[PDB]
Amino acid sequence: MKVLFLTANEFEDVELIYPYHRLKEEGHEVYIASFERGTITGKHGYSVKVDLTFDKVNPEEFDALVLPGGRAPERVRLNEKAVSIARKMFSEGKPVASICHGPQILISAGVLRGRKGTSYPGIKDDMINAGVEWVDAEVVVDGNWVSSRVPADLYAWMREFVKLLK
Amino acid sequence: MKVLFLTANEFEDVELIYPYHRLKEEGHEVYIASFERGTITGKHGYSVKVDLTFDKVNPEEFDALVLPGGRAPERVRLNEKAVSIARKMFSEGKPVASICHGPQILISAGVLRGRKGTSYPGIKDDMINAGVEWVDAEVVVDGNWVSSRVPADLYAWMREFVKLLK
Amino acid sequence: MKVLFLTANEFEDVELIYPYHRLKEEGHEVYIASFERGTITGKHGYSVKVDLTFDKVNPEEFDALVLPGGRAPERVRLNEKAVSIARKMFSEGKPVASICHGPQILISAGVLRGRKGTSYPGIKDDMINAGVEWVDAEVVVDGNWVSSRVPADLYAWMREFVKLLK
Amino acid sequence: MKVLFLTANEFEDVELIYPYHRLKEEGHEVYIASFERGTITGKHGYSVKVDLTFDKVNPEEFDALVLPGGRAPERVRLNEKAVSIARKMFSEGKPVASICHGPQILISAGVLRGRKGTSYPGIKDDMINAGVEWVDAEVVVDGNWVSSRVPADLYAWMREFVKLLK
Amino acid sequence: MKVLFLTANEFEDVELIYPYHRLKEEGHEVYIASFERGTITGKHGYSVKVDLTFDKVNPEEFDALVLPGGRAPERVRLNEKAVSIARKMFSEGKPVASICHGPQILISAGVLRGRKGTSYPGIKDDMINAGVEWVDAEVVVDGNWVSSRVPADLYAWMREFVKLLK
Amino acid sequence: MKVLFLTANEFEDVELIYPYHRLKEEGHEVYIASFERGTITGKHGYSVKVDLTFDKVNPEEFDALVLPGGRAPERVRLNEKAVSIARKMFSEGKPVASICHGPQILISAGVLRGRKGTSYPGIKDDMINAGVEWVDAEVVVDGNWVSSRVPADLYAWMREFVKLLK
Ligand SMILES: O=C(CO)CO
Ligand SMILES: O=C(CO)CO
Ligand SMILES: [Tb+3]
Ligand SMILES: [Tb+3]
C-alpha cells in the first residue's frame, strides 16, 4: 500500500511522525505531500522532507490517506488541489485517517455529511455543522474513516487504521 | 459604554491590544474576561491582566462585546458560560466586533444563521456551514455585527465598530 | 496627511502597529522607513513591510513623524540620514509622536534642549541630560511633540497625536 | 506486560512518545520513571507525566525496559539507582529497547561487553570501548537487546521490539 | 580583592560570565548583586546565582566593581540603592569596569562628567550628554575606570582591568 | 602562538568564547575550524565566524589546540579529518585544552589510554573505557593535556592552560 499524507508547516509533530513510522512498520510506502518540495517544520521544530507537491499528486496512485493535525490543516484546506485529493480519496472509499485539526480538510472537501467521527474538541461545532455525528472518543471507525482527537489517542488511532490497510 | 472582551491564552496579541486601546481613547471602559483572574499571554508573548472570570460576567452589565482572534477562541468556545455571554449579547442586538478566529465563539453560540460577515479565511467553510454569507472584505457591518479577517484589517475594523458605540 | 515612521528591526511591536492603524483609520497615509526595503521584525515577532529607505526619504514630502520604541531606536539613532530626517521635521514644527525608547532618536538629533516630555523611565536620565524636563505621565503634549512612556499609554498617546493632525 | 521507561528532561521527544504509544497499542502497560514525580519535558517541548521515581522502582515488577535518547541518558546514567535498574533488567534477560543515546545507560550498567548492537553514531566509539560489536543498521536484535540509532529508525526499532514481548 | 557585580535579568551573558571567571583566575573573590536572592537569567539563557541583594551591599566591603551590559542596566539604573553603590565606589576611586550598556548605571550615578571612556555605540550620545569624552576603542583606561563597547572587546577589557587590581 | 579550536554548531557558548578571549589577551592568535566557512551558532545562540574548514587545516601550522564542549564534539568526532588533527597535535605533545564534552574528540583520536584528566561527569564512563584515569576536579594537568568539566571551571581551566603556552 502507498499511503499519502497531506500536510504543511506547523503540523503537530507526533501526529505526522507517529503514523509515518507505524505504517512503515507494516511495509507500506509513505509519502509526504505539501505546497512545495524541500522540507516542512512542525509546531515543535521537527523537520520532514516533502516527497511531492499537491500539484504533482495523482490520487489514483495512492491507496490511503493520512491527515495529521496542528495548524497545517487551516493552510491545506484553502488549497483547491489538496482538498480535491482528499475529496477523491475519501469519496472513493479509500482508508482515510484523521486526527485533531486534520478533518478540517475533509470539512472543506464537503464529504462528511452523515458521517460519524471525532476531532480536536475545539472544532467539534464545526464538524457538527458539516453534518458529522461527533463522538467524544479516542478513536472512531466509520467505514473507511478512522478519526481521533489528540496526541494522547495515537495508540488507538493507528491500532484501528492498520486494520483497514490489511 | 462598558465593553467586554472574551479571550484566553494564545490570543492574537494585536487583535486584543488594538481595540482595547482604541476604545479607551473614546472614554469607554474596557474589561478583559477569561477563565481565571491573573494574567493571560498572547501568541506573541504580550501579557494582559484579566479583569473578571467568565463566571462573574453578568451580560446585562456590558454594552458591547469584542472577540479577538488567535488560538484563544477554540478554548473560549468550549466554555458554556463564555458562549452564553456571546449568545445573549449578540442576540440582544448589542454591538459585537469579531476578528480572525474570534467568530468561532459566535458559531458555537448558534447566532450566525442567516447573517453576513467575515473571518480568518482559513475558517470560511466553518462560517458558511454555520449559515454565514461569507464576504472577503477588510470589514463587514451587518447590523450589530462588525467583522474583520486579519491584523492588516485593524484600522477598518475599529473605524466601523467605534461608529456603533457612538 | 502623510505620516512617516522611522524604525528598524526589534521595534516594540504594538508601538508601531497601533499608531499605524490608528492613523490609517483617519484616512492618513502611513509610511514605514528603515535601513533597507523588504521587511523588519519586532521584538515579539510581528513582521512589517518597509515602504522606503532612510536614504530615499525627502522630509519635505511628509507632514508628521512617529517614533516607536523597542531596541530599534538605538540602531536608528546611529544613522545620520534618519537622525537628519527627525531633526528637520521636529525643528520645522511638524507633529512628532514618540513613545518609550523612540525619543533616543530626538536626543541624537539635538532638538530636545529646553523641551518637555516623557519616555520609557529607564532612559529618563538620558532625556534630562539632553535638556528635557522629564514628566512621569501617560502622555505629554509640548507644542508639536507628543510623547508617551510604555505600551499601556497607547490610548492616550494617539488620542493626543490625532488632534495635532486634524 | 509492564514496560518501564527510564528517562529525564531533554529526552528526544519522538523516541519516548513513539514506543509509548506503539506498546500501548498491543495492550501493554507503560510506565515513565524519572528523578521526580510531576512532568518531564523533551528537547522539542512535549511534556509527559512521570509515573514513578527511580527510587520507587522495583525492577522485579516490570517485564521490559525502554531507553529513549536525547540528552536525558547522560543525566540518567549518573543516577546509580536508575543504572542499577537497567543492569538488573538487562542482565536478567528481560527485553530492553534502546535508541540513539539511550544505550549510554547500558554502558554505565556494565552489561554490554561482548554484545552486539547500535546507537547514535556520534557515540559509536564509546559503545565500542564498552565492548559492543557496533553495527551501522536501523535495528539490531541481539537476544533480549533491540537497538536503533536515530528517529528515522523508529519503525524498525519497535517492529522488532514488539516481537520480543509477544 | 572582593569584586562586586551590579546586574539583573537580561544581562548580556558573556559580559557577566567572562569577567567573573577572569577575575577568579587571579584569586579575587567575585560577588553577584541584584534585586533579589535566587537566580538571574541572561539574554541568552545562562542562569547565575545572586549572592546578595542591592539592599544588603555595604560598598565599603568591596574593592572593585564590574558593570556588565545587556538590558539589565536600564533596570539597575532605576534602583536608588544600586546607583548609590556605583556612585560611592566610583567616586572613591575604586576600580570600575564597564562594558556595552553597563555605564548607563554610572550615568545615573552622576559621576561621569569630564571622564574619558566608551560604551555600546548606540548610547554614545547619552554618554556625551552625561559629560563623557567618548572614544571609539575596544578598551579605554581613565584612571580607575576601564570601559569597553561590545563582546568582541572582552579580551582587551579584562586585560586592562586585571592590571588595576594588581 | 597560533591556537586552533575544533568545534561546530551547538558548541557550549562560553566554553568557546571564554578561551578565545582569554588567549587573545596573551597576544596569541586564535582560529576557529569547523565543517564549513561562514558562521556557527552555540547552544545559547551566540554566533561566531569560522576561520577555516577542517579540510584546510594543516596541524603543523598550529601550536596548541582547544576543544570546547556542548553537543558539537559528537559531530566533530565523526569527521575523520578533525579527529586526525586532534590525534596529530595531541600525540606530538602540543598543548591541548578540553572541557566538558570536548574530550570526546580525543577519545575518537585514540590518544587517551593511560592519560589522566576529566570531562563533563555524564561521559566519565566513556573516558574511563577509553583508558583515562578520570578525576573529579575543576582542572587536571597531565603534561600537555589540560582538562576541565563544566562552565563553572572556566577560571581554573585557562589559568592552567595559559601557563603551558608561556
Ligand atoms: O448561503 C450562506 C449561508 O447562509 C453560505 O454561502
Ligand atoms: O531642567 C531639565 C533640563 O531642561 C532637567 O530636569
Ligand atoms: Tb578491549
Ligand atoms: Tb581496559
The three state secondary structure string of chain E is CEEEEECCCCECHHHHHHHHHHHHHCCCEEEEEECCCEEEECCCCCEEEECEEHHHCCHHHCCEEEECCECHHHHHCCCHHHHHHHHHHHHCCCCEEEECCCCHHHHHHCCCCCCEECCCHHHHHHHHHCCCEECCCCCEEECCEEEECCHHHHHHHHHHHHHHHC
Q: At E33, give phi and psi (nearest 5°).
A: -110, 140
C22 touches chain B (CB under 8 A): yes
The partner residues of A40 in beta bridges, in order of sequence, read A48
CA F16 to chain centre: 9
The one-letter amino acid code at A51 reads D
Distance (Å) of CA F96 to CA F28, F92, F138, F141, F142:
15, 10, 16, 10, 10
Give CA–CA dist D66/D51, Å, rounded.
14
Grid cell of F55 as nine digits = 579540510
Give CA–CA dist D9/D36, Å, rounded.
11
Domain covering E1-166: architecture: 3-Layer(aba) Sandwich (3.40)
Q: E22 to chain F nearest CA, in Å? A: 6
Q: Looking at beta carbons, which residues of chain A come within 8 Å of B69? A: none
Give CA–CA dist E21/E162, Å, rounded.
12
B126 touches chain A (CB under 8 A): yes
Looking only at the bridges linking them, the beta strands covering E29-34 and E2-6 are: parallel
Contact D74, D80 (CB under 8 A): no
Give CA–CA dist E56/D117, Å, rounded.
58
What are the structural domain ranges in chain C? 1-166
Instruction: Please enumerate in sequence order all residues whose Cβ is within 8 A of that of C16, keeping only pairs 6 or more positions apart, or say none.
Output: C5, C7, C32, C42, C48, C68
Distance (Å) of CA C70 to CA B111, B151, D95:
42, 20, 57
Report DSSP letters for chain F, one per residue: -EEEEE--TTB-HHHHHHHHHHHHHTT-EEEEEESSSEEEE-TTS-EEEE-EEGGG--GGG-SEEEE--BSHHHHHTT-HHHHHHHHHHHHTT--EEEETTTTHHHHHHT--TT-EE---GGGHHHHHHTT-EE--SS-EEETTEEEE-SGGGHHHHHHHHHHHH-
Looking only at the bridges linking them, the beta strands covering F38-41 and F47-50 are: antiparallel
Q: B89 to chain C nearest CA, in Å? A: 25
Of C40, C103, C113, the C-alpha closest to C67 is: C103
Atom of ligand 2 nearest to the CA of C114: 4
Determine the 3-state secondary structure of C12 from DSSP. coil
CA E160 to chain centre: 14
Q: Which of B128, B129, B136 to mutate to test the pocket of ligand 1 (most atoms within 8 A of CB)?
A: B128
Determine the 3-state secondary structure of D115 from DSSP. coil
Sequence-separated contacts (24+) of C33-40 with Cβ below 8 Å: C33/C4, C33/C5, C33/C6, C33/C7, C33/C57, C33/C82, C33/C85, C34/C6, C34/C7, C34/C8, C34/C9, C35/C8, C35/C75, C35/C79, C40/C7, C40/C8, C40/C9, C40/C11, C40/C72
Looking only at the bridges linking them, the beta strands covering D96-99 and D64-67 are: parallel
Q: Do chains D and B touch (3 or more CB pairs under 8 A)?
A: no
Q: Verify whether the Cβ–Cβ distance D18 to A13 is below 8 Å.
A: no
CA C45 to chain centre: 20
The one-letter amino acid code at C24 reads K
Nearest CA to ligand 2 atom 4: C131
Contact B9, B41 (CB under 8 A): yes
Of B131, B139, B61, the C-alpha closest to B99 is: B139
Residue with the three cell numbers 561621569 = E112
Q: A148 to chain D nearest CA, in Å? A: 14
Q: Looking at beta carbons, which residues of chain D come within 8 Å of A17? A: 14, 18, 151, 154
Q: Could you say which DSSP state residue D7 is in?
A: -
Contact C151, C158 (CB under 8 A): no
Give CA–CA dist D165/D147, Å, rounded.
15
**Helices A154-165, D13-25: inter-axial angle, 10-degree rounding:** 60
The partner residues of F146 in beta bridges, in order of sequence, read F97, F141
Grid cell of B19 as nine digits = 481595540
Q: DSSP H helical segments within chain B, as ranges?
A: 13-25, 72-76, 80-91, 104-109, 124-129, 154-165
Instruction: Please enumerate in sequence order all residues whose Cβ is within 8 A of that of E64, keeping only pairs 6 or more positions apart, or say none.
Output: E1, E2, E3, E4, E28, E89, E94, E95, E96, E97, E164, E165
Instruction: Please enumerate in sequence order all residues whose Cβ is within 8 A of that of A105, keeping only pairs 6 or more positions apart, or say none.
Output: A6, A67, A73, A76, A77, A82, A83, A86, A98
Of B130, B77, B79, the C-alpha closest to B105 is: B77
Contact A161, A140 (CB under 8 A): no
Residue with the three cell numbers 603534561 = F143
The ligand 1 site (C-beta within 6 Å) comprises B 114, 128, 131-133
CA F90 to chain centre: 11
Number of Cβ within a 10 Å radius of residue B165: 15
Q: Looking at beta carbons, which residues of chain D come within 8 Å of F122? A: 74-75, 77-78
| Burial zone of F31 (CB within 10 Å; 0-12 exposed, 13-18 middle, 19+ buried) | middle
Contact B65, B89 (CB under 8 A): yes
Give CA–CA dist D40/D8, Å, rounded.
6
Q: Which residue from B78, B120, B129 is facing A126, i.e. has the nearest CB?
A: B129
Q: At E122, give phi and psi (nearest 5°).
A: -60, -25
Contact E140, E116 (CB under 8 A): yes
Give CA–CA dist D105/D69, Å, rounded.
10
Grid cell of D46 as nine digits = 512535549
The partner residues of B66 in beta bridges, in order of sequence, read B5, B97
**Method of elucidation:** X-ray
Distance (Å) of CA B107 to CA A122, B89, C53:
12, 14, 44
Give CA–CA dist B146/B90, Å, rounded.
11
Dmax over CA atoms of chain B, in Å, equals 38
